[PDB]
């Protein structure tokens, strides 16, 4: 009867996954099967396939956070985050629009702030910044050279990110990556690392001392990206879900989607990997399923989340959890 979280069993390295295909832009498979696919195409260390360890299988079993946790080797911090927000559309639709049939002004403002974000441009911004960081670390063999290479291209590109503080989440993103300091990972050599991207959907009204309106309909001033840089301050994100509007209404607090480092230029053709919930086949929610969605399917989101952040972190180049190409389903 226990809806307790269980860790999926170990899958032999030769066991091939059962076939599955996307339907209307999204594919899904039970987590036991996705482990088989992950071991075939994502597990390589220096080109050598590996079995998903007991620890990784435990991380994965926690739900949508598990895919990103396993692929990046770290529980997501969301320290370096980007998003796009049309300030002019938000200000105009506030001072020109009107609440629809059945909306509090706190609900109208919350929705307009939600619809003013552009998740395509937000993912596009994180794309271009991650490319600058990868070029900076290409031939840099110490962090000092990486920071010098990074600032050089940002200044020549007239990117406002150049003026970030030396200890900001942006400039400290590489040195704060645990695998960067590990002797089997980066070994303090930026040229052995690579920038990767995942996304987080979450709720804006997370201040427990704020009005119930913002907890139920959103805080328009919360989690807006800074001008010029597009950086989102994720320090006040505390994994707090949207508050219910009526009794019985349940909301999920966040959602994590793994992009990696795909080379496909079409944002709409990029694949995002996420899970529905934690693994409990003997319990209420059932077994965890891993979803592989096209970008527009992922960025469609839900009413649970009014915010989207596109995060940059780093993994060693020796890994294969962020390959150039990601294929939905199997084979």
């Amino acid at each position: 009867d226990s809806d307790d979280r269980v860790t999926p069993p170990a899958e032999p390295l030769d066991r091939m996954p059962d076939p599955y295909r996307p339907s209307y832009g999204r594919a899904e498979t039970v987590v036991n099967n996705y482990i088989r696919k992950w071991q075939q195409v994502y597990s390589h260390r220096d080109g050598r396939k590996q079995q998903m360890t007991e620890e990784q299988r435990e991380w994965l079993s926690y739900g949508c956070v598990g895919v990103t946790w396993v692929n990046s080797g770290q529980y997501p911090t969301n320290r370096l985050a980007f998003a796009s927000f049309d300030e002019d559309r938000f200000k105009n639709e506030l001072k020109n629009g009107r609440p629809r049939s059945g909306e509090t002004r706190a609900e109208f403002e919350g929705r307009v702030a939600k619809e003013s974000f552009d998740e395509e441009k937000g993912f596009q911004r994180a794309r271009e910044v991650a490319s600058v960081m990868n070029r900076a670390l290409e031939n840099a063999h110490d962090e000092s050279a990486y920071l010098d290479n990074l600032k050089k291209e940002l200044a020549n590109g007239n990117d406002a990110l150049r003026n970030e503080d030396a200890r900001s989440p942006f400039y400290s993103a590489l040195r704060n990556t645990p695998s960067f300091k590990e002797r089997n990972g980066g070994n303090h050599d930026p040229s052995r690392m690579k920038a990767v991207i995942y996304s987080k959907h979450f709720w804006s009204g997370q201040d427990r001392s704020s009005s119930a309106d913002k907890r139920k309909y959103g805080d328009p001033d919360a989690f807006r990206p800074a001008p010029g840089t597009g950086l989102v301050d994720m320090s006040r994100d505390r994994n707090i879900p949207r508050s219910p509007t009526s009794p019985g209404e349940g909301f999920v607090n966040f959602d994590y989607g793994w992009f990696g480092a795909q080379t496909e230029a079409d944002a709409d053709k990029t694949v995002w990997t996420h899970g529905n919930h934690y693994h409990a086949p003997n319990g209420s929610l059932g077994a965890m399923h891993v979803y592989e969605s096209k970008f527009r399917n992922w960025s469609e989101g839900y009413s649970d989340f009014d915010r989207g952040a596109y995060v940059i972190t780093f993994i060693p180049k020796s890994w294969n959890t962020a390959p150039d190409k990601v294929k939905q389903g199997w084979p």
């Binding site: 809806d3 926690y62 956070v65 994994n239 999920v252 959602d255 919930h277 934690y278 929610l285």
Partner: peptide, 8 residues
């Protein structure tokens, strides 16, 4: 703590 695992 705050539960994760996407149970609403």
């Amino acid at each position: 703590d705050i539960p994760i695992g996407s149970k609403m």
